[PDB]
Nucleic acid binder design. Structure first.
Lengths: 133, 132, 53, 193
RNA sequence: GACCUUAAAGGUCACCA
RNA sequence: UGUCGGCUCUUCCUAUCCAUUUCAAGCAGAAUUGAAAAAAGGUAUGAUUGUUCACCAUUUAAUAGGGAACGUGAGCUGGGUUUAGACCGUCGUGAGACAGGUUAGUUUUACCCUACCGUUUCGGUAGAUUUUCAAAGUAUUUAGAUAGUAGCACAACUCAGUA
RNA sequence: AAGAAACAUAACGAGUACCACAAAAGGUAUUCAUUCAUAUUGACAAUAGGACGGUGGG
């Protein structure tokens, strides 16, 4: 469901990295299991940056979301990444929103800023984002 | 579970028929040796062809049975039932032996058990003959 | 939308050939031997299967 | 078995002049010239006058002769004779190969250069890539009617290969060739005159 | 598999590496 | 002749999993299936187990199978196995036994030759004599028998909701 | 060590026994031989024509 390409965004989120859920779906935190499109290497852990659709499990939330495997998109990250126009930028916390394969967000609202890279990749996230940074 | 045909191809050892000294022999596969019109008078069929073995080797009872069925199906289709008479001229009078090993087993202290039957043929010996 | 006249020249170039059962290679209509060397110049060939509907 | 003498001959018509220099035949006719080299180390090519008809008169012929030689070698005598016969035919009544374009849905537009030494096949099965297909020297393409072309020339090997190059450049790939009957096919091969 | 016993069935052994 | 596995690293085989080129189908398209050329390049992350093996959850174009003293301990580790302590079960009158289970148990030496990787010192190639030439020494600019070899893969737009 | 004749050789095919390997099977590949038929006053290959009537039974 993603539209277009994404430039180089350094991936600061690993396997077993706990992020927050900015949705209103009753899931609090997710831990990344593996990253869609990740090209494997020996002893390398899967890596995710902004706008990267990951496969994550919810270890904290309401019972219909806990102890299950969902699909999310990283909207912000604490790792410092550089834009193509010489802008160096980083957020306050790692957050994600639950989307399906077709790319529509399960929730209805997003809390906090949403990075441009994830907003342009997924048109559904940008519509429900408060601000795009 | 049957051993490869190359294990018991060469003619080795004295003939070892089934008798009061050799017990527990499985029944040979082939039972019918004359097929076709076995009662046809000597003048109906003037022709004669042979299968002549050019090797000194063991021929298992299974190979003779497979050949007997192969000729039977082909000849019934072609010449009909009452137009041919094929007689197999090798019998499985020789009994092969197998030393099955189960490492908790004896290494070499054992003499083989009965395994099957085969016909020790030689060079220039007619195997199967038929008249039509 | 292809006239039958053009069908004949197209099918002959594409369909009316024999196939070696061992080479797998394309052979002419009247051939009697697998032309390619890898298949051992085999002698059993089958016509290319005609399309049907 | 080995043949003591295998021979063949080609009848030279009037408007044809042939000169030979060490298995190198040059044939000149009303339509031009044609030079070919036959580098077989066991054939003797020489022009003579021979009576080839049952009751006919003498006529100028080219005799291709190979003496004692096995059946693998002996096959080349008629091969060379056919080549020389084709060369004579080309310079008198040149060859032409009428190819036709076959399409199901996507029309194919042929763009031929002004002089005729190149073609251009466009929109073959909707493909954006445009095929060029260069032509051999002495072969000229032209458009006869609709979806039909013809290659003119004096050497059959040049005309035939150029025609096959056009067809070989428009092959359907990864699709059922029994259903997607597309491309340019040689309808027939004939002489101009 | 080996030994024993019953009218196929059991019972003991199957170890050092 | 240090006896399992794992970790690290290199190379080799093709009976090829992917990528490249082709042929066949009971190949309409898509997805597939059988086969040929081809071994230059790739072939992953984790839960349980000392495990090889296996079974699950993912991801990927693919997550192929194997050799090299069952590659590799003066390369590591010591989880297992395999001394000496101890416990249980069965067997034995007893000392004791157990391809029955559990727990604790010292991992030595390269400074030698070669190999490999880098790094110095000394030696040096035979047939030209147009003094506008020939040769030796020092120095620079070049030269290139041979040896190695490097780029791969994927995704998005358009083609096109077209064939 | 020179000459002679052949079946090989368009392939890492062949090349000093023991000895350091290869099988069944397949080939309108090639050489020789045997058996049968047509071989001419006209076979096979090829070009040209006929290929039929009741009979919707050469």
């Amino acid at each position: 469901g993603r539209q277009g390409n994404k430039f180089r965004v350094t991936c600061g989120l690993n396997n077993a990295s706990t992020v927050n859920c900015a949705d209103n779906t009753g899931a609090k935190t997710l831990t990344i299991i593996s990253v869609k499109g990740f090209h494997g290497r020996l002893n390398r852990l899967p890596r995710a940056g902004c706008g990267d659709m990951v496969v994550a499990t919810c270890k904290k939330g309401k019972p219909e979301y806990r102890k299950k495997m969902h699909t999310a998109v990283i909207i912000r990250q604490r790792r410092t990444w550089r834009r193509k126009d010489g802008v160096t930028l980083y957020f306050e916390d790692n957050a994600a929103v639950i989307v399906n394969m077709k790319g529509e967000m399960k929730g209805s609202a997003i809390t906090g800023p949403v990075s441009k890279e994830s907003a342009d990749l997924w048109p559904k996230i940008s519509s429900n984002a408060p601000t795009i940074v | 579970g049957r051993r490869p045909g190359r294990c018991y191809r060469l003619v080795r050892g004295h003939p070892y028929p089934k008798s009061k000294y050799c017990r527990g022999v499985p029944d040979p596969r082939i039972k019918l040796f004359d097929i076709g019109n076995r009662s046809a008078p000597c003048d109906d069929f003037p022709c004669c062809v042979h299968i002549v073995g050019l090797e000194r080797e063991n021929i298992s009872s299974e190979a003779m049975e497979a050949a007997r069925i192969s000729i039977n199906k082909n000849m019934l289709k072609y010449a009909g039932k009452d137009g041919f008479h094929v007689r197999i001229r090798i019998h499985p009078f020789h009994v092969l032996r197998i030393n099955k090993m189960l490492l908790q087993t004896g290494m070499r202290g054992a003499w083989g058990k009965s395994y099957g039957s085969c016909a020790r043929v030689k060079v220039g010996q007619v195997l199967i003959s038929g008249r039509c | 939308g292809i006239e039958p006249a053009l069908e004949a020249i197209a099918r002959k170039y594409n369909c009316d050939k024999m196939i070696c059962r061992r080479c797998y290679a394309r052979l002419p209509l009247r051939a009697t031997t697998c032309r390619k060397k890898k298949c051992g110049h085999s002698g059993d060939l089958r016509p290319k299967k005609k399309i049907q509907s | 078995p080995r043949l003591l003498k295998k021979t063949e001959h080609v009848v030279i018509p009037e408007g044809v002049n042939i000169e030979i220099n060490r298995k190198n035949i040059k044939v000149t006719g009303p339509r031009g010239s044609l030079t070919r080299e036959f580098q077989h180390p066991k054939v003797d090519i020489y022009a003579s006058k021979l009576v080839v008809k049952k009751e006919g008169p003498k006529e100028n012929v080219v005799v291709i002769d190979m003496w004692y030689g096995n059946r693998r070698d002996s096959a080349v005598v008629r091969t060379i004779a056919s080549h020389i016969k084709n060369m004579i035919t080309g310079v008198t009544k040149g060859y032409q190969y009428k190819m036709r374009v076959v399409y199901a849905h996507f029309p194919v537009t042929l763009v031929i250069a002004d002089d005729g030494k190149s073609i251009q096949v466009q929109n073959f099965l909707g493909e954006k890539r445009t095929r060029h297909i260069e032509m051999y020297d002495g072969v000229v393409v032209k458009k006869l009617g609709k979806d039909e072309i013809c290659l003119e020339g004096n050497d059959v090997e040049k005309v035939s290969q150029s025609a096959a190059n056009i067809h070989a450049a428009n092959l359907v790939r990864n699709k059922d060739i029994r259903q997607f009957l597309d491309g340019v096919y040689v309808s027939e091969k004939c002489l101009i005159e």
